[PDB]
């Protein structure tokens, strides 16, 4: 399963089970986090 690991570009791909796509409102800093 090719998914966005801890802190990976999730713009088009989703974060792996356990991480969340944390992105700013401006449209940047879109990275996965263990939230």
């Amino acid at each position: 399963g090719y998914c966005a690991e801890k802190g990976i570009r999730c713009d088009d791909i989703h974060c792996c089970t356990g991480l969340k796509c944390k992105c700013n409102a401006s449209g940047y800093n879109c990275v996965c986090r263990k939230k």
Side-chain angles (χ1 to χ4, degrees), residues 3-34:
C3 53
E5 311 189 318
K6 202 237 211 161
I8 308 300
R9 55 224 111 75
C10 52
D11 202 309
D12 202 336
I13 192 142
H14 275 320
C15 296
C16 299
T17 347
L19 293 149
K20 195 104 165 194
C21 197
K22 205 116 272 270
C23 179
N24 302 359
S26 303
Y28 308 93
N29 277 269
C30 315
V31 91
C32 288
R33 271 164 242 194
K34 192 183 134 282

